[PDB]
Each structure stands twice: as C-alpha cells, then as structure tokens.
Amino acid sequence: APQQINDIVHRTITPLIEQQKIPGMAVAVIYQGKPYYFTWGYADIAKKQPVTQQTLFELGSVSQTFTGVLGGDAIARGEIKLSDPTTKYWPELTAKQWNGITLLHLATYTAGGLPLQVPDEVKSSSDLLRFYQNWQPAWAPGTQRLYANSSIGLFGALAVKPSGLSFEQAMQTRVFQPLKLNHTWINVPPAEEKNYAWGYREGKAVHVSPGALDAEAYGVKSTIEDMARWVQSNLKPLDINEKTLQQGIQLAQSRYWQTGDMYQGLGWEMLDWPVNPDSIINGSDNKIALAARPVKAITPPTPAVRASWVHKTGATGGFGSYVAFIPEKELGIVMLANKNYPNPARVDAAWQILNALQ
C-alpha cells in the first residue's frame, strides 16, 4: 500500500480508536480507483475474534444509500416516478394530509415532518397503515427537511411495489448481485454468522433489533471489501454494465433540495468541494441536535456534480459507520466501527484522510 496512504490512515485512525474506545474498526480508502484496506481490534471481544476484511458490520442509516439507488433503478426501469403521489402506490392511504405528498418527498425527508423512528409497537402491515394514516404533518410538503427513518423507509417499501418483488429480493437481484456485493445482506445467513461482528453499547454486545421498515431504513450489514466496492460503483457509475442501475446511481446523486451548504440526493447528501470539516458537520446529520431545516427546491434537480463531497453517516445501537467520496478526484473512504461514536469525529477523520490524498 503506498506509504502515504498507510501513514495518513494509521496516524488518523489510531488516535480515533483510542479516544473513542472503539472495540473494532475497518477502513477502506479508494485512491485513483483502487481500494486499500485497514483493520483494528475486535469483531467479538469475548471470543477474541479480530476484525478482518470479511467481518460484517451493521451500516445503520448508510443502508439508505442502497435504498436510494434501488429506487433510482426503479425510476430508470419506468416502474415509478418521483413526481407520483404516495397514494398511487398505497391507495389505502386515504387520510387527506397525504394529498400532495410525493415519492420525492418521502425519499428526501421533506414530506412535512414524518417521525425519526417508526414506533416499536408497529409490527403488522395493518399497524403500519394506521401509523401513517394517523400521522399529522407539522408543515406543508416540500418546505422543511427533517431526517426521518419513517420517510426514506416508506419510500423504499413503495418503490419496489410495481416490481412484484419483496424489498430484499429486489435489492439482492437489482443492486447487490449486479455489483458483486456477495457479502452484503439484509438478513445475515446462519452460514455467515461467524463473520458478523457484535456491536457494543455501554460495553454490552448488541445486534440491531427487528422493526417495521428496518430493511429499507437501516437493515444492511456489509464487509469493508463490499463497501469499498459500493463506493467505487458510486464514484464511477459509467463503468456499470446494467443500464438502469447505472442510471439509478446517477439519480441518487442528483441535487433535489438545498439547505445551507448541503444538497439532498436519494440516500446520499452532498456539499460542493472544496469545503472544510466544520461546514460539513454544520451542513449534515449530526447525531447530536435533531434539526428541522427549511429547504429550497432545485428546479429541475442538478445532475450529479463531480466536484462534490458526497457522504452518508449511519448508526445502530452498537455500530457507527461513515462513507464519503469525491468523484472528480476518484477518491473515497469507508469507516465501519462496532461502536456508535460521535459523528463529528467521523467527519474529522475522513476529512483529515481525504484532504491529505488530494
């Protein structure tokens, strides 16, 4: 591995692991289109299993980048349109507050303040219908962005309805297989459990619990190798053979709304490059303050901009993940850890590393 990459990665990540007390971590840097891997610590403390390039980590919200691309692929196939009303794909949603709420609003968190989480008491499909039917928006659609798993989650479920496939089968067949993400799962099979890291929360080993729309909002578990491959696909969609998938990746990176220095895509969020860490943090999902932010529509959406810092942060109770890439520099990074540590620290480390390799 080029010593420059070796040095900046280790000199940045070692202090990070030390300061955040992270049990295990895997990092991939994509430089000029090739991946370089790094791992530290334990996937399982009690059983002393080390983190390897084959260890599976829960991606949490980073899963939404896959959901966003899968929806983009569905648009490309002519199965759905972002301008179509939510009720076109769920006619049972008759409550009037849904008038005017489109698939675009669901995918981009601008439906009017859908909740951060679907409540635990929501199990069945009838329970889910009840939940959305009873929800009362605080705002008109397309006026404010409020990050929400119940918004992108619903988008994922509806986007695959025309296909006739379950969300997982659609994801496997249309995204994972074509890109050869052969160790990426929504449900980890028994044969792969030996590689599934435990997450750690307050010192206790934990895995994400089942919940409504979990597959769509936070259900992916993946290895550092598959995630590096996911970043390469997103860096260079033109290299992808499947037409609708190539188009779908491009649609997920288009800029639909702007708030401050940030642009909202489908799953991915973007800022113009160059930009410093403080601005990225202020213009993004920060685990800390949950913010309602007014948005300006980009009419029509700007196609993916090469000079962008494209990223997504994610977490589950015991895992913290971060992905960021800059298309015009063919540069990217993935950081997977089995501890949910502060987002600002993730952005600071990713920026320190990618800034150094410009």
Swiss-Prot record:
A beta-lactam binds at S61, Q117, Y147, N149, A315, N340. One of its GO terms (molecular function) is beta-lactamase activity. Changing N286A: Reduces binding affinity of inhibitor compound 1 about 17-fold. SUPFAM superfamilies: beta-lactamase/transpeptidase-like (SSF56601). Pfam families: Beta-lactamase. Induction: Can be induced by beta-lactams. Expression is not up-regulated by the non-beta-lactam inhibitor, benzo(b)thiophene-2-boronic acid (BZBTH2B). Its EC number is 3.5.2.6. Its main location: periplasm. Changing N149A: Lowers activity more than 6000-fold. GO terms for cellular component: outer membrane-bounded periplasmic space. Keywords: Antibiotic resistance, Hydrolase, Periplasm, Signal. Inhibited by the beta-lactamase-blocking agents avibactam, enmetazobactam, relebactam, nacubactam, vaborbactam, taniborbactam, zidebactam, and beta-lactam-analog boronic acids, via a covalent binding to Ser-61. Inhibited by non-beta-lactam, benzo(b)thiophene-2-boronic acid (BZBTH2B) and various cyclic boronates. Not inhibited by clavulanic acid. Inhibited by O-aryloxycarbonyl hydroxamates, via cross-linking of the active site Ser-61 to Lys-312. Weakly inhibited by citric acid. Disulfide bonds: none annotated. Transmembrane segments: none annotated. GO terms for biological process: antibiotic catabolic process; response to antibiotic. It is an enzyme of class 3 (hydrolase). It catalyses: a beta-lactam + H2O = a substituted beta-amino acid. The keyword Signal applies. The active site is at S61 (acyl-ester intermediate). Monomer. Class C beta-lactamase which confers resistance to penicillins and cephalosporins. Has benzylpenicillin- and cephaloridine-hydrolyzing activity. Has weak cefuroxime, cefotaxime, cefoxitin and oxacillin-hydrolyzing activities. The class C beta-lactamase family has a specific amino-acid numbering system known as SANC, for structural alignment-based numbering of class C beta-lactamases, or else the simpler name structural position. A multiple sequence alignment was used to derive a consensus sequence and then the consensus was numbered taking into account insertions and deletions. This allows use of identical numbers, e.g. for active site residues, despite differences in protein length. Belongs to the class-C beta-lactamase family. This is Beta-lactamase. It comes from Escherichia coli (strain K12). The gene is ampC.
